[PDB]
Amino acid sequence: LIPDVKLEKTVPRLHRPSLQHFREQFLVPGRPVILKGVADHWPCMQKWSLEYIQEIAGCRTVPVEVGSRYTDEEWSQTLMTVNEFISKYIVNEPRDVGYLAQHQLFDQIPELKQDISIPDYCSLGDGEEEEITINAWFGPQGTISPLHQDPQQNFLVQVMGRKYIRLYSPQESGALYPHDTHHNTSQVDVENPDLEKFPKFAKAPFLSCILSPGEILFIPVKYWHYVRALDLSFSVSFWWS
Ligand SMILES: O=C(O)CCC(=O)C(=O)O
Ligand SMILES: [Mn+2]
């Protein structure tokens, strides 16, 4: 099912905003934004199909997550070839949901680095271009990344399919009942909250969006984010500082 994003506050969308504007209105204040017209002509957008990914990467071994990431004990990873993953969790009637998440596929397969680029906005950071972490997120409809926060800025680029994303600023942490302050994860199920056990969550303000191919979501450092895939999906994240 597709959530109704127009009833919720939508993440603003901007087409190729200037570096200065992005820095002053978004990076410095820590405000989410969607960048349009930047990655939509990346080669990956037209080249990366299920067939092409299976052809180039199908023999390489990757980690595959299964379980709810709400707690360490609730999930685990299995190392398997890309072909095995595609067969078991995408094409054949998947009883369980499997997710090739948070994997540095582009270090494993440098050719794929030719199909993507580093966003120009990353040059506004302090860190170097070499310490930027590029992660692949490839999985079926229905994958869910529970509400959590990360210690770096993020550009999340959608290549294949659509994702529903909810964002809560760092100043809402109280209403999100973190498991452990010291990357931190919420105890709440965004789309099915226990309203007795988590009363403060109902009124917490948030932004939401459906991110589609060619769009980039800027997730400010330590902004809380929740992600559900709406279709067979492939995203590329850029963690930078
Ligand atoms: O795409 C997802 O399922 C989650 C991505 C995420 O947590 C990130 O890019 O930092
Ligand atoms: Mn994250």
Author numbering: 174 to 355, 358 to 416
What did the study's authors say about this model?
JMJD5 is a JmjC domain-containing protein, present in both the nucleus and the cytoplasm. Building from an extensive peptide-based screen for potential JMJD5 substrates, our results provide evidence that JMJD5 is a JmjC-hydroxylase, catalysing the stereoselective C-3 hydroxylation of arginyl residues in sequences from proteins involved in chromatin stability (RCCD1) and translation (RPS6). Consistent with previous reports, JMJD5 residues 174–416 fold into mixed helical and β-strand topology comprising seven α-helices, 13 β-strands and 3 310 helices. Like most 2OG-oxygenases, the JMJD5 active site contains a metal centre, which is octahedrally coordinated by an HXD..H motif (H321 and D323/βII, H400/βVII), the 2OG oxalyl group and a water molecule, which is likely replaced by a dioxygen during catalysis.
We obtained multiple JMJD5 structures in complex with 2OG or the broad-spectrum inhibitor NOG (IC50 6 ± 1.4 µM for JMJD5) in the P3221 (JMJD5153-416) or P212121 (JMJD5183-416) space groups. The two methylenes of 2OG are tightly bound in a hydrophobic region formed by the sidechains of W310 (βI), L329 (βIII), and V402 (βVII). In the 2OG complex structures, part of β3–β4 loop is either disordered, or has an 'open' conformation relative to the substrate bound form.
